[PDB]
């Protein structure tokens, strides 16, 4: 069952993505086939190789350095337009995508992505847009990245109500939090995280508690079918003491609140390094608890790779 | 879009699920009807009231009692070829179920189940025979019930090769040990536990690893897509020291071990009370840890409820 794809964007995710497609392009009898991939110097289009495509840009930066092949320059609109895959799939850090899965899903064309923005702020258009046209939309590596809690949640549980879910999404923040119980200053932690490429130049997504916030909204939207009315960010400027500390998102129905929250020795969200935690409690479970990695090249593709296959056999969209 | 459902078996499991059909029937514009129910007294069949079954057979303790219902007394084949329903539910502890699944998957009905040894046992043969004829079988409540471990390897992890799982996923033995850990003897352990519910008369099934062994044959059935070349089974008659100790099912690929195991107190394998946990280690994400509730009855319809969802909307059987 052969199924075309773009990969628009090609950085750490997207170059691990191609490993990933490269090993399992043949898989519980599918075929997936990348015609496209797009980074800002363009779009390359056709019959290249994966795996090539993947050394050329990591060697030199660029897809439009590729040998045997030639580069386009299609806008997000021209991508879908032109090539036409089955499955647009975004793995960039372009913030306003959601245009771009809006002609997409316009045309029939189901979206898989990484990129959190489009889904914390458009999910119930996007979905509309889907579901009118026959599509599918799969975000898996937007929550937790490869630690599959949108599974959990969108496609098990379906008997449950969801009374509340709490999580620890942002391992910059656990990493500045750690290093502060260890010693160091706020600021020597922020200039010591920077130097390890864990936090930007401007550190204010991960340490004001945005991506975290972002997070909790898709988490809400996948809960309860619809945004918030109460939210409540903030971030861990303001930790005096980080001892046993982290950034909690907190998510029930109609609310949300990521801010720092004291969490005992034993609790399942005192979480190290890269892992992230989710505690789920519903109706008929209680607490349901899922831990797994929340960031790296491999481990956001894995996730990207499950909703490839999903949208591929048309999984649908309860939630 | 409309479906007839025959339940076959009406325990703790079969009523709970009566309850949870009850409060969402009409869910995901699914329509969900109960046709027939079954239990030793007999199958009722038709356009009886599901709670008032479920408070008859509570009160009498059969299916007989219903007020202007006669039972049929059907054979497993007699009940598929004459109820025709779109979906069996099968949660009984009748061991040789499987009999019944070939003649209702001959027939193109899907099977969701609660009961392991069919699973365990004749997977490979179940899942030909369901795709043979366009059907599918699901069996979440199978292995820590409710908690969705099926739905996270069967449906998610679709890029990640499973190199090994470790799970504690029998509370009767953890609740022996626990006592076993505080003074009492082994066969005192038991005969409290027997008072209190949660060992048989005949107990041997928790006590010699038979249920976690059934349970580890099916997530590497999940997993691996065959039957194991190597098996050990051990139980906990044994133990002596049985502080921080549980039995511990290990699955790996062509082999299963289930024996008890101290743990340190950080293992997140150390559950208590009810709980159940699985240590998933994969290729790309390393260690994904799920854990939740293992038993009771509205926690194992919960399972088989999800599992009734997915039948009705065709999710596909990957692994
Ligand atoms: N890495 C991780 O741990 C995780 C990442 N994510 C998300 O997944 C996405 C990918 O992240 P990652 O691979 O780490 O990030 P990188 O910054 O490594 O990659 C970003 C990619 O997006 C491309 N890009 C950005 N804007 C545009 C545009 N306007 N037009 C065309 N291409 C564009 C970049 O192009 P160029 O190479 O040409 O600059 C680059 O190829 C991001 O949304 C991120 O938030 C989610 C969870 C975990
Ligand atoms: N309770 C739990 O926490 C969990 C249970 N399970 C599994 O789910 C299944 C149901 O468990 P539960 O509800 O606790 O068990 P119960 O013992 O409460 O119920 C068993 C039911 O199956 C019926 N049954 C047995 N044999 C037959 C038969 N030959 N024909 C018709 N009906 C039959 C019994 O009928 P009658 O009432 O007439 O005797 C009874 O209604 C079992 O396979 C169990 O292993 C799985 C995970 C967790
Ligand atoms: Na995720
Ligand atoms: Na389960």
Redesign the interface.
């Known amino acids: 069952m052969k199924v075309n794809i773009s990969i628009f964007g090609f950085g750490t995710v997207g170059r691990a993505l191609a490993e ?1 497609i490269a090993e ?1 392009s043949r ?2 009898g599918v075929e997936l086939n990348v015609i496209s991939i797009t980074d800002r110097s363009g779009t390359i289009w056709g019959d290249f190789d994966l795996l090539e495509a993947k050394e050329v840009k990591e060697s030199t930066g660029k897809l439009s350095n590729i040998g045997d092949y030639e580069v386009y320059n299609f806008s997000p609109q021209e991508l879908v337009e032109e090539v036409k895959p089955n499955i647009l799939v975004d793995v960039s850090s372009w913030d306003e995508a959601h245009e771009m899965y809006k002609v997409a899903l316009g045309e029939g064309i189901s979206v898989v992505t990484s990129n959190k923005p489009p889904i914390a702020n458009y999910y119930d258009e996007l979905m509309n847009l889907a579901k009118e046209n026959n599509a599918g939309i799969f975000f ?1 590596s937007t929550v937790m990245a ?3 809690i949108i ?2 949640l969108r ?6 109500n969801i009374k509340r879910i709490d999580a620890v999404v942002n391992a910059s923040t656990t990493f500045i939090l750690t290093k502060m119980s260890e010693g160091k200053t706020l600021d020597d932690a922020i200039e010591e995280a920077k130097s390890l490429g864990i936090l930007e130049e401007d550190p204010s997504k991960d340490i004001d508690g945005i991506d975290a916030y972002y997070k909790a909204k898709i988490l809400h939207w996948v809960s309860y079918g619809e945004p918030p009315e109460e939210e409540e960010r903030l971030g861990i400027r303001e930790v005096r003491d980080a001892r046993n500390v982290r950034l909690v998102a907190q998510v029930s129905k109609g609310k949300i609140s990521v801010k720092p929250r004291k969490l005992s020795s ?1 609790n ?1 969200l005192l979480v190290e390094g890269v892992q992230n935690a989710a505690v789920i409690r ?1 109706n ?10 929340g960031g790296g090249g ?2 956001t ?2 996730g990207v ?2 909703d490839i ?2 949208a591929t ?1 048309k ?2 969209n ?1 939630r």
Chains 1, 2 share one sequence.
Do not use: C, Q
Request: proline share 10%; charged share 20%.
């Open positions: 990933i399992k898989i519980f898996e490869g630690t599959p599974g959990v496609e098990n549980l379906l008997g449950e034993d399942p519903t008929n479970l209680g607490e349901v608890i899922l831990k797994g990695p491999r481990v593709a894995s790779f499950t296959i999903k056999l999984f649908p309860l």
